[PDB]
């Protein structure tokens, strides 16, 4: 894969890897970790104020190519934060790995740039519950509330959904055909914070879909308190 001009690397792996050798000039970042509750227009604007922080703080500024082993959630969640904070990016899952030499961490002087959310990247709850077409990409016994995680109250899913599990997105030839979705067509995709879903995301786009990411995800839908089957 070739990379873009004066890119920003970011290294979504754990810690340890990352010291034990990571790209030139590479920050360490995995926004795995944070839950939001995206309802009100403070709190999308607080996610983008957060963004901001974080993009100076990293000294952060298009183009920025973030790279992991393989397409993993980690990779994909953090990626779609920052693109999702106006940022240009680009995942790179394989062929860095001869370039990750260096051990000291750098310490970048905060860049002035300015977060600016691309909500039409996203979906908010409300969005996700009045989609025509909602991909609940996590396994199947999840979506059929036999299991969940400890943080969430009870198994279930969002009414109307449709199963996609993460897998299928991982053999992109003929994945369109097999989900029947064609180019241009808007479709959601949810989980549980938004991390496999993450990767439906980047996979469907590049696919030419319209895919957007319910980043409040299933355990948003429970604490809130909207209706879920079974
Ligand atoms: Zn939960």
């Not at 396994?139 to 009870?154: L, N």
């Given at each position: 894969?070739?990379?873009?001009?004066?890119?920003?690397?970011?290294?979504?792996?754990?810690?340890?890897?990352?010291?034990?050798?990571?790209?030139?000039?590479?920050?360490?970042?995995?926004?795995?970790?944070?839950?939001?509750?995206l309802?009100?227009?403070?709190?999308?604007?607080?996610?983008?104020?957060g963004?901001?922080?974080?993009?100076?703080?990293?000294?952060?500024?298009?183009?920025?190519?973030?790279?992991?082993?393989?397409?993993?959630?980690?990779?994909?969640?953090?990626?779609?934060?920052?693109?999702?904070?106006?940022?240009?990016?680009?995942?790179?899952?394989?062929?860095?790995?001869?370039?990750?030499?260096?051990?000291?961490?750098?310490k970048?002087?905060?860049?002035?740039?300015?977060?600016?959310?691309?909500?039409?990247?996203?979906?908010?709850?409300?969005?996700?519950?009045?989609?025509?077409?909602?991909?609940?990409?996590?396994?199947?016994?999840?979506?059929?509330?036999?299991?969940?995680?400890?943080?969430?109250?009870?198994?279930?899913?969002?009414?109307?959904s449709?199963?996609?599990?993460?897998?299928?997105?991982?053999?992109?030839?003929?994945?369109?055909?097999?989900?029947?979705?064609?180019?241009?067509?808007?479709?959601?995709?949810?989980?549980?914070?938004?991390?496999?879903?993450?990767?439906?995301?980047?996979?469907?786009?590049?696919?030419?879909?319209?895919?957007?990411?319910?980043?409040?995800?299933?355990?948003?839908?429970?604490?809130?308190?909207?209706?879920?089957?079974?």
């Amino acid at each position: 894969m070739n990379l873009p001009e004066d890119a920003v690397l970011v290294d979504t792996r754990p810690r340890p890897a990352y010291e034990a050798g990571h790209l030139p000039g590479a920050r360490h970042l995995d926004l795995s970790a944070p839950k939001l509750r995206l309802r009100e227009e403070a709190e999308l604007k607080a996610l983008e104020g957060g963004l901001t922080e974080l993009f100076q703080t990293l000294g952060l500024r298009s183009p920025v190519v973030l790279y992991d082993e393989g397409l993993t959630s980690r990779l994909c969640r953090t990626a779609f934060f920052l693109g999702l904070g106006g940022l240009e990016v680009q995942l790179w899952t394989e062929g860095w790995e001869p370039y990750a030499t260096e051990k000291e961490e750098p310490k970048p002087e905060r860049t002035e740039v300015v977060a600016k959310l691309r909500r039409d990247w996203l979906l908010t709850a409300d969005e996700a519950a009045r989609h025509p077409l909602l991909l609940d990409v996590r396994s199947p016994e999840e979506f059929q509330g036999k299991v969940h995680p400890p943080c969430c109250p009870r198994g279930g899913r969002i009414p109307g959904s449709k199963n996609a599990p993460l897998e299928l997105f991982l053999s992109p030839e003929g994945l369109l055909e097999r989900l029947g979705l064609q180019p241009g067509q808007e479709v959601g995709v949810y989980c549980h914070s938004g991390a496999r879903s993450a990767v439906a995301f980047f996979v469907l786009r590049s696919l030419g879909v319209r895919a957007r990411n319910y980043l409040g995800s299933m355990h948003e839908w429970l604490q809130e308190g909207l209706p879920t089957e079974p």
